[PDB]
């Protein structure tokens, strides 16, 4: 009787509108309507939960190499596609062949701008989003060929070129500012060992001005809290080792409230809709918080589980987010894509794997072949790859230095 979303008491988690209908309530009721079908189907005239690995693999394999014109609108996000596909192959535990690794490398090299960073495609101008994605990808490959693609001197200049007086960073030259760009600078700067004393001056204070009355963080000061900006906020501070800047208690109250009592998934902001990729952006905050309350002695932390219903998140991802053709979705009756394939999987991995000091405790719903490789919650690549790269770049000096 052992599946949380199919228990009879679970019918009570349905929306109560208090007889006052609004757009928000009508839409929430429609999703809960669909999700109910999916659940009452799995029970019909018992069966298990399987992660369709072979199907997801074929989809990924093929995409890494070639794409129809439906994908024209991702023509300035190619390194980002690389990262989405390699991360999902890495999670599903799929060795990358060497001629594929090699092709990825030479490609990212053509995306690299002569003044530093990577652009969305060969000969495009550089931008922080494809820059983090390219670096992450090179790390997933984890070889010396890949590590040497990155021009660390030019990376650091590029980053100085984006840094603002008030602590923030532009996404690209003449571009806009938001918390994503700080995360990106922190992620790339710290894996490649290029942090100088002043690079992040003002940055952690800028980030905290972004934490708002709700507990979460918004894209820039004043803005509503959102899972994507919050994760980047927290994670960038964990990198800078300034988690203390934020009010971690209100941040915790906020994220835990973003798990949906019926669906099991996460919404990205309050009173909006469940969405598969928030399985990483929201639920990956719990590991970050766990390690932060712990480095302040919190003695009330658990040592089996993160502070969300891991079981119920897994049930959402496995029953509602899988495409029978391969790949994963926002929610039922959407169509798949590589971004959701990547982040639904990253979130399933996180809901599977607890680790804290010397504690480890896994929780794998459905068949045991469902287990994924663990992901590092700051960088969202594998913990080994993170170690291997940091170690390797630590051998060279920060530039403008020795």
């Amino acid at each position: 009787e052992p599946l949380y979303s199919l228990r009879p008491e679970h019918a009570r988690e349905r929306l109560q509108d208090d007889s006052v209908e609004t757009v928000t309530s009508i839409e929430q009721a429609k999703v809960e309507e669909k999700i109910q079908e999916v659940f009452s189907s799995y029970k019909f005239n018992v069966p298990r939960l399987v992660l369709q690995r072979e199907k997801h693999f074929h989809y990924l394999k093929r995409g890494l190499r070639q794409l129809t014109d439906a994908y024209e609108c991702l023509d300035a996000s190619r390194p980002t596609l690389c990262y989405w596909i390699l991360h999902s192959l890495e999670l599903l535990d799929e060795p990358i062949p060497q001629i594929v690794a090699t092709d990825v490398c030479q490609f990212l090299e053509l995306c690299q701008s002569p003044d530093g960073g990577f652009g969305g495609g060969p000969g495009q101008y550089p931008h922080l989003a494809p820059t983090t994605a390219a670096v992450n990808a090179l790390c997933i490959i984890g070889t010396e060929e890949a590590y040497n693609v990155i021009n660390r001197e030019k990376l650091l200049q590029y980053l100085y070129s984006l840094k603002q007086p008030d602590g923030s960073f532009l996404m690209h030259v003449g571009g806009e500012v938001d918390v994503r760009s700080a995360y990106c600078a922190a992620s790339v700067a710290s894996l490649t060992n290029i942090i100088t004393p002043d690079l992040f001056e003002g940055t952690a204070e800028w980030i905290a001005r972004c934490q708002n009355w709700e507990g979460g963080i918004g894209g820039v000061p004043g803005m509503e809290a959102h899972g994507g900006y919050t994760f980047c906020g927290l994670a960038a501070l964990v990198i800078l080792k300034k988690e203390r800047s934020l009010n971690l208690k209100s941040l915790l109250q906020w994220v835990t409230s973003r798990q949906m009592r019926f669906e099991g998934g996460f919404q990205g902001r309050c009173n909006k809709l469940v969405d598969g990729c928030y399985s990483f952006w929201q639920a990956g905050l719990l590991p970050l918080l766990h390690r932060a309350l712990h480095a302040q002695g919190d003695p009330a932390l658990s040592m089996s589980h993160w502070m969300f219903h891991q079981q119920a998140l897994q049930e959402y991802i496995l029953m509602c987010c899988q495409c029978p053709a391969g790949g994963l979705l926002d929610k039922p009756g959407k169509s798949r894509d590589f971004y959701h394939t990547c982040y639904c999987l990253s979130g399933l991995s996180i809901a599977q794997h607890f680790g804290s000091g010397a504690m480890l405790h896994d929780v794998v719903m459905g068949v045991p072949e469902n287990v994924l490789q663990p992901t590092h919650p700051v960088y969202n690549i594998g913990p080994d790859k993170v170690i291997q790269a940091t170690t390797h770049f630590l051998q060279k000096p920060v530039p403008g230095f020795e």
Partner: protein
Amino acid sequence: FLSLDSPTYVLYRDRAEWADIDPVPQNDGPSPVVQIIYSEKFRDVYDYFRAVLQRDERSERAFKLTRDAIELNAANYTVWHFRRVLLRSLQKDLQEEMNYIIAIIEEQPKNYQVWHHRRVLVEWLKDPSQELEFIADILNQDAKNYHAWQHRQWVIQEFRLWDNELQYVDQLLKEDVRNNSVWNQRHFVISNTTGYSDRAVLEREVQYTLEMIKLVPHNESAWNYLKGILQDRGLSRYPNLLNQLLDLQPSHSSPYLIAFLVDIYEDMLENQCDNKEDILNKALELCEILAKEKDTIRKEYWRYIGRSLQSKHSR
């Protein structure tokens, strides 16, 4: 000029007025990854785009071309960059450009690059006159569009246009009291105008939020706002509050009510009040109710709050 959906559309490589220029094919190298098999229109346009970008041709035909390249892929930030270089070079009529960017936003309201472009025009013109009304039309179609709200906050802060914003907030709250973007905007206006220390203001606000909570006990947005105004100062500073909530409970009792009460007891224990070991129990009784019946999705969060109170408020 010659729109991409016109029956008469002609690839650039067949246009006479482009005959002097050799197109520049993309360099994906010998054996590419994430290779996109672009349509014929798309690849033709971008082949010419690369030729002008590379020559740095600051020309009228280069300008009309960027429009096409954007229509095919509005997220190519490199193309938007080049278009702004041409508005400076060719000294184009920036008001014409405002009309262009309005149409595109209506067509693709969730694209970053289109809003960034609009803002740069406004910085250039120093002219906010159309902004609030334009934003209001988009918000009429998607009341939660994050980028629209972001642009609204930027326009208001920048050109100090605070005077009608609260009435706007109030109109929208009436339309959908669950729109958390509006509750956030309410707070944005108030905190930058009057502040929340004017006790007259902090009263009207708290009064109002309870009035909404009464109509819709299960609307989380209001509960988060109530908490977020009072939490600054400390909830035990407001003794009437505990009892006023306890009065809502037999009828209007969401799981948010229960959790607020826990927040109040939490603040009382923290301020050394009377009945320490009594109140520490009424709290733990709710933690267990929530974790174990009324809010189990957060079972782990509440078991942790329970174990925090004990570990802090004992001997």
